[PDB]
Amino acid sequence: STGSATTTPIDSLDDAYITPVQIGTPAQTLNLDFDTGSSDLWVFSSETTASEVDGQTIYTPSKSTTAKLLSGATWSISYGDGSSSSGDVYTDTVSVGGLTVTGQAVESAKKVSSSFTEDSTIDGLLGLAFSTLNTVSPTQQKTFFDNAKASLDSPVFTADLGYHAPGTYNFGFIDTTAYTGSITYTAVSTKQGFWEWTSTGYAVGSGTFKSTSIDGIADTGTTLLYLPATVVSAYWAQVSGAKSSSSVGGYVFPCSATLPSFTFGVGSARIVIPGDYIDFGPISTGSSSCFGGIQSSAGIGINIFGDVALKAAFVVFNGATTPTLGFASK
Ligand SMILES: NCCc1cccnc1
Numbered sequence: 498s499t500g501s502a503t504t505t506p507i508d509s510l511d512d513a514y515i516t517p518v519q520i521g522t523p524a525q526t527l528n529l530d531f532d533t534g535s536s537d538l539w540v541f542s543s544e545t546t547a548s549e550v551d552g553q554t555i556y557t558p559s560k561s562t563t564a565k566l567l568s569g570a571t572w573s574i575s576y577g578d579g580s581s582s583s584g585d586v587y588t589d590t591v592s593v594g595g596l597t598v599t600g601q602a603v604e605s606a607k608k609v610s611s612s613f614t615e616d617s618t619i620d621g622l623l624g625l626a627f628s629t630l631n632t633v634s635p636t637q638q639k640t641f642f643d644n645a646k647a648s649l650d651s652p653v654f655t656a657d658l659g660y661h662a663p664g665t666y667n668f669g670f671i672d673t674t675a676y677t678g679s680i681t682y683t684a685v686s687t688k689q690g691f692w693e694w695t696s697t698g699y700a701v702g703s704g705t706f707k708s709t710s711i712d713g714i715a716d717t718g719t720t721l722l723y724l725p726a727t728v729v730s731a732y733w734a735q736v737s738g739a740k741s742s743s744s745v746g747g748y749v750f751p752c753s754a755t756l757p758s759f760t761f762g763v764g765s766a767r768i769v770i771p772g773d774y775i776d777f778g779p780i781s782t783g784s785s786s787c788f789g790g791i792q793s794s795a796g797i798g799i800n801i802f803g804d805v806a807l808k809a810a811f812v813v814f815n816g817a818t819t820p821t822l823g824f825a826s827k
Contacts, residue, residue, distance in 0.1 A: 498669060504665060514804070527555075528619065530718060532623065533626055540606065540621035581609075593623075593668065602633060602639070630690035650669045677827055683823075687820060692714055698710075708762070712800060721790050724800050769826070775790035776789075
């Protein structure tokens, strides 16, 4: 089997991407944030505290003939940005782009933090990291990809995120028309439960490539590119007037600037992020200070190749017995 679904930016800045997902019988379609940095499939639901729902589409398990309470199971997750959610668990039929998993754990939110409430466009998250990170207790549950894997034509999924445009998540096949040149594959460590890999270096603009190992995670659920302070300083030093602002919470730059590109290494290959991908717009409406798309990972504990980086590539998440990651230009 295979699946193919379009993923769409939630706003004009590509702050996140949503992908329609069918849950239950008859289908209830929710727009989920596919997140290769976590491993829970959770949704706004009929159980979510009413004051914490503001415009989201909800899953109502009582209206699904295939929903079953997973008795005694609870979940609770906290993300790197300080957001969180928790609740109980149903199993139900879940389909993405024509690919169907029966008995998928669908984690129903009883509580969500303010940032989730405030984002009316995101109805939940669909985790695509390794199932070892799944938070369901006392019986840990599998991700949609792990459940689907054995049925897939090939044990892979791909992320093809657009810049200010829709893109695609495919399951079970590699669309050889979706990228240019060849795909370079690189080793993955699953020790922390992430798609963790080591970039071979970077360049800023037309500058020389610096060969240096940068361990980080491929995380579709993180908006920005978070890298070591040395790398990030070298980038922003090439933008007149750019500075790190503690009050704003990162590097900002004059909105009048033309940003240089940023290149990262994948083995001997190179992925170029155009400068425009690094512009996240005015810090507040009408401001001439703009927020940067490359930020320091110093306070995080891990480097994160988020959407800013991934959207510059066609990315293969290879879930074979020994997982690997592939990157191609496009
Ligand atoms: N790997 C990104 C985790 C995440 C998801 C949704 C909101 N905040 C953080």
